[PDB]
Amino acid sequence: LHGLLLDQHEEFFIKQFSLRVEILPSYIPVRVAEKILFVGESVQMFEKNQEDTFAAELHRLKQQPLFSLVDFEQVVDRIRSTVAEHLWKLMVEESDLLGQLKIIKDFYLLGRGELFQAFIDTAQHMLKTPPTAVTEHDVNVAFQQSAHKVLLDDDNLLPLLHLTIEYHGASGWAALGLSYKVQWPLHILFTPAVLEKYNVVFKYLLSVRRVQAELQHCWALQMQRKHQTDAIKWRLRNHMAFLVDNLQYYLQVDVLESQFSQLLHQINSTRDFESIRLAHDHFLSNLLAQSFILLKPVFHCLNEILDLCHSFCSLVSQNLGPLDERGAAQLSILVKGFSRQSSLLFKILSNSDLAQLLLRLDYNKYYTQ
Amino acid sequence: KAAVDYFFVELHLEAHYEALRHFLLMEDGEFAQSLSDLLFEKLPGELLNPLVLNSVLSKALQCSLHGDTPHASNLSLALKYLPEVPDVLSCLELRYKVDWPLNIVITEGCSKYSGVFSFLLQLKLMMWALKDVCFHLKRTAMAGSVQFRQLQLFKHEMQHFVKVIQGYIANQILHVTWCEFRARLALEEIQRAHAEYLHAVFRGLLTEKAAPVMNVIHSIFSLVLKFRSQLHPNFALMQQSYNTFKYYSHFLFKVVTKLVNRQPHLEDFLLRINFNNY
Amino acid sequence: REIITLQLGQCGNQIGFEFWKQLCAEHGISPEGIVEEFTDRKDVFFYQYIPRAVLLRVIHSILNSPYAKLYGNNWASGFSQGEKIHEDIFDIIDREADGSDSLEGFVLCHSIAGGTGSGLGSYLLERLNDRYPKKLVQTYSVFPVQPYNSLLTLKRLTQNADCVVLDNTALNRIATDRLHIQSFSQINQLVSTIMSASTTTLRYPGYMNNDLIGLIASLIPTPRLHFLMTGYTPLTTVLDVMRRLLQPKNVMVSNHCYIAILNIIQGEVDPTQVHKSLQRIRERKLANFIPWGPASIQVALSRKSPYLRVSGLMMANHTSISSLFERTCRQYDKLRKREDNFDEMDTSREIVQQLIDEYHAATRPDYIS
Amino acid sequence: REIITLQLGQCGNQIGFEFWKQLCAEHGISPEGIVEEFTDRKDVFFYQYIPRAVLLRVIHSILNSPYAKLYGNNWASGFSQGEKIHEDIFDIIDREADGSDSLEGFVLCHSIAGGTGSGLGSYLLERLNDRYPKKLVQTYSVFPVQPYNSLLTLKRLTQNADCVVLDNTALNRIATDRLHIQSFSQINQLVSTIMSASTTTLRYPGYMNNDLIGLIASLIPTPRLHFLMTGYTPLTTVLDVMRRLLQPKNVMVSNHCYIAILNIIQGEVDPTQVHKSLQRIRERKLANFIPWGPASIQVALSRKSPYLRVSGLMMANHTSISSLFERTCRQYDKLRKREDNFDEMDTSREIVQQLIDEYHAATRPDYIS
Secondary structure (H helix, E strand, O other): OOOOOOOOOOOOOOOOOOOOOOOOOOOOOHHHHHHHHHHHHHHHOOOOHHHHHHHHHHHHHHHOOOOOHHHHHHHHHHHHHHHHHHHHHHHHHHOOHHHHHHHHHHHOOOOOHHHHHHHHHHOOHHHHOOOOOOHHHHHHHHHHHHHHHOOOOOOOOOOOEEEEEOOOOOOHHHHEEEEEOOOOHHHOOOOOOHHHHHHHHHHHHHHHHHHHHHHHHHHHHHOOOOOOOOOOHHHHHHHHHHHHHHOOOOOOOOOHHHHHHHHHHHHOOOOOOHHHHHHHHHHHHHHHHHOOOOOHHHHHHHHHHHHHHHHHHHHHHOOOOOOOOOHHHHHHHHHHHHHHHHHHHHHHHOOOOHHHHHHHOOOOHHHHO | OHHHHHHHHHHOHHHHHHHHHHHOOOOOOOOHHHHHHHHHHHOOOOOOOOOOHHHHHHHHHHHOOOOOOOOOOOOEOOOOOOOOOOOOOOOOOOEOOOOHHHHOOOOOOOOHHHHHHHHHHHHHHHHHHHHHHHHHOHHHOOOOOHHHHHHHHHHHHHHHHHHHHHHHHHHHHHHHHHHOOOOOOOOHHHHHHHHHHOOOOOOOOOOOOOHHHHHHHHHHHHHHHHHHHOOOOOHHHHHHHHHHHHHHHHHHHHHHHHOOOOOHHHHHHHHHHOOOOO | OEEEEEEOHHHHHHHHHHHHHHHHHHOOEOOOOOEOOOOOOOOOOEEOOEEOEEEOOHHHHHHHOOOHHHOOOOHHHHHHHHHHOHHHHHHHHHHHHHHOOOEEEEEEEOEOOOHHHHHHHHHHHHHHHHHOOOOEEEEOOEOOOHHHHHHHHHHHHOOOOOOOOOOHHHHHHHHHHOOOOOOHHHHHHHHHHHHHHHOHHHHOOOOOOOOOHHHHOOOOOOOOOOOOEEEEOOOOOHHHHHHHHOOOOOEOOOOOOEEEEEEEEOOOOOOOOHHHHHHHHHHHOOOOOOOOOOOOEEEEEOOOOOOOOOOOEEEEEEOOHHHHHHHHHHHHHHHHOOOOOOOHHHHHHHHHHHHHHHHHOOOOOOOOO | OEEEEEEOHHHHHHHHHHHHHHHHHHOOEOOOOOEOOOOOOOOOOEEOOEEOOOEOOHHHHHHHOOOOOOOOOOHHHHHHHHHHOHHHHHHHHHHHHHOOOOEEEEEEEOEOOOOHHHHHHHHHHHHHHHHOOOOOOEEOOEEOOHHHHHHHHHHHHOOOOOOOOEEHHHHHHHHHHHOOOOOHHHHHHHHHHHHHHHOHHHHOOOOOOOOHHHHHHHHOOOOOOOOOEEEEOOOOOHHHHHHHHOOOOOOOOOOOOEEEEEEEEOOOOOHHHHHHHHHHHHHHOOOOEOOOOOOOEEEEEOOOOOOOOOOEEEEEEEOOHHHHHHHHHHHHHHHHOOOOOOOHHHHHHHHHHHHHHHHHOOOOOOOOO
């Protein structure tokens, strides 16, 4: 109830605080020990009638001539549920979490994708080169030129977004990232741990966005190039590389807008705050699990498909004539690997892939593969 | 709460701030345009005794059309150096004065106004001397030839650079830095809030951090003064001067750009100096 | 990335105004082109508010409406006029292009049957490909001496317009059965609904589909197969709306199989059960597909205008659309044997023969080569 | 520094009257020239209140107005009458000149549409350069045998007046559109508004531009290119004002680029965003400037009359003003072939054709030399 621990010899089992197990009593279960560690830190960080009455309860236990654990919890859990109810009141109503989560979904998870296709359109040449000590500022301006380019005018939450360049510990895109200076109230909900797994999603989701925006520009040229019996192999490969990518870019609006719609529903349901720290935590773990980022085999096979399109799209853009000067000689290289990589993936999916493989197999084309 | 309230509703702390700005920071026109205009009419032993400079102020306040209040007094127009003898420097201070219950808040060091003042006055020396050559050439008008029209285009090309650097100052040190500290106030805080309002010296390019940006300004201001000396017997002597002006200005645009990577205040400068050019 | 819209002919200028009064109503835009108080990205169609329109007798009818501040009959006759006002209109078009930041496409509304459309619409498509070569030109053309104007125009739309047909016969039919009208002023109400929902995903910030390329590239695989069809069901779950799309009783049309499907949902349906709906559709096998190439069925979500319940629009690429061409070209041959060079109308019949051939050959297991 | 006005012809005496009404309304000055009870320096225009007016038929009705206590058709005939009263009228000017402390300029309100004042305007400017060579003169001329009287006064205005054009044609377009008049006293309501706000920085003290030479010296680059146009948007933040000013729908005028702009804001708007609006105008590239010298746009703030909402004035020097002259002089050549020496009309046509050459030469990247 006072957030401080009166101790100068490391006696009590608590020593940003932590918990102690090598000194914790025997008959006390760890479950209530965790409950104690939370009910206090929620006061020390936080800096009426809900204060004195509990003091009478604790004092009452001191009169009991026999330590009854079955009662020790009925006083702890009420204290726990009261501060949790009091904390949820602030973490949602006073300090609006919905507005803040709405910011994270837009920028971290590419929710506002329309801002990034312009930022990619501008800050492109300055990242294919290896990174140096100056590129960190060369992009923060381009990102700032972007938000104004989409008529988004808001001096709030604009300087809070600072792109980072992991330099000196190599293509520039591989080190790109976005950090977020969190405010004071949500400092407990968004630790450097949870705010890091978010970044990994932004790294991957941007890549698929980069290759897709790149790939379709080539289509904007093939159709444009309407005025060779072998040049037609391009679109017969482009569309193959398109459907696998575009629909892979689906299941994303239906894993984000579906997992998110649960995370927001678990919030407005439980008056308790302890659920939010777990509902949000499970929401994050699902994205790493559903989006196949943790599944190594698929993530190490589709990755080959990613950089594969970079080569093909460049091949069509690096010229304006038919594929004769060893381009066709380079063209048939990838199809022997791509189509091999294509059906290689097919055996992998044959829990969560059911939502994905269904879309690619709508016409049973891979069934003929 | 009763201590702070005692200051506003009884001793007019809100008035003193919005009054010293009228006089020191030269916000009130028809006063700087009348003080600087008088002093610049003269230019040694003259213009230094308390009979002219201690009296030019009492002649200036009459042409202010704003003031002549108990606040308007206590404008000691003193000096801090004895000049011996084309440059852009004329050292002269202008110190406000207060009494006991207000002296404890407005620090005797917050001396820094005198730091930002001598710059702002130096700026007026351009818009008057440059106005002179614009007015000195008017009486020359029959005399229409390539040597004439090509000459006047230099003034329009040099004036615009001063009329844009001034428009910057009239935006940072008088309006946006005044938006803060006016909607910020509404006893210890008054000391720090004031120490944060003036600390006007950061957006004013007077800080030693961005000092190289200020050093280049003198090269610009100096060449305009030389342009005033040659009020077409020596046209080519002036043609070389303008070409030096176009080089230094073209060098400023690069030194400010290189200093963007390392200050959001300077960001608005490049948008001012550069607009549809490089 | 903005889209400049052009409107030609009486039918084109009429549908556009009804498309404009519909669009500005979905937003908080007063008829005086001023925002009313009362997130919705409005930059794609409006310039900072003015719509990026170029309208080309009926103009008087538009300026008499309270929306005033919003801004012969032979094929040979229409074309001759075009070359005479060649320079006059392009300065109107060019100045709008330079005014836009990054112009992307060209929406055109015109009717092949309409004389002015059959004369002036055809001329622009050749000039538009000449001046600006890297800009897509998509048209909302609408099928109805009458066969002549139609086939001569189709000769241009198959090589110039890289991308939707609206048949008045089916529209007049739908008017009787489910609307019970019997005029032009009533059927246009439903026309505006199609064009509006066609560009829903662009006017609201989403995850993908943030450009006109984001919709068309998945539909058109080859420069020849570039004809689409629309379907508007509501005249409630996600599985409910799809079963009404595939019924030919609502598609405005009069072996055969599709190429790719794009589904647009404007409701607030739970996005979790959409993957359940697709599974039952593949089980029922309600639509036939192509076996040669990989294709999939797509679906997208958006938000209805709040200032104005589930709607639905589908984009279909069917080979049955070739029959409508045959009917027209059949009547063309009928008038050819009954009645300066008379040669241009001869080559036009030959080039459209390739188009109908490409679709009839597309429904074979050996469409390639 | 005091300013004095002169009003000639029927037009100048009319708009100057309403100019005196609106200005007298800004300050707490009763119609009877007496201050009522109810900061603003009222000494530049008023002299202890007495306005420094000089009025040269309608004058009878002017004294019949409640503001009484506030004080042929050819060009050569208008020039002759000015010579017959050379000394008689001039005494009023002199006695008002040195009786004033320090004269700064001479505001001239007159019309050039064939009136006796139009010639009367030509004469005064010749003598104003004769007697006082150190006194600026500004004139708010207004544009419509009418070609004759118009082109002649242009010969004097280009070498005497060191500095605002207003064409009735572009004014009436504003009248029918946003006031719906379908009169003379109706359009001048807006005209007086332009002049009133034109001297907002003079009657109210500010930091920059505290004198009539403070406004003109920046815009006019050479004594020849000395023509200005105006803009007045309120008929809401800073980005709303400047964007509505640059539109050709608001300009009071019937390649091409700007030389200098001046925007006067009269509201209490938040000055923190004035730099942001400057960024968005640059990036969208909504206006085009000269290529040779660095040309910018300047803005200054002031305060409205507290007795009487965000207003704004736009002052510009656009080389498109050359087109207006071409409309005039073209009519002259047509009237030159259709109808004591007729030699003055020659040099007049000669000198303006030098000016029309001077504008067209300013738009080239090599205007120097």
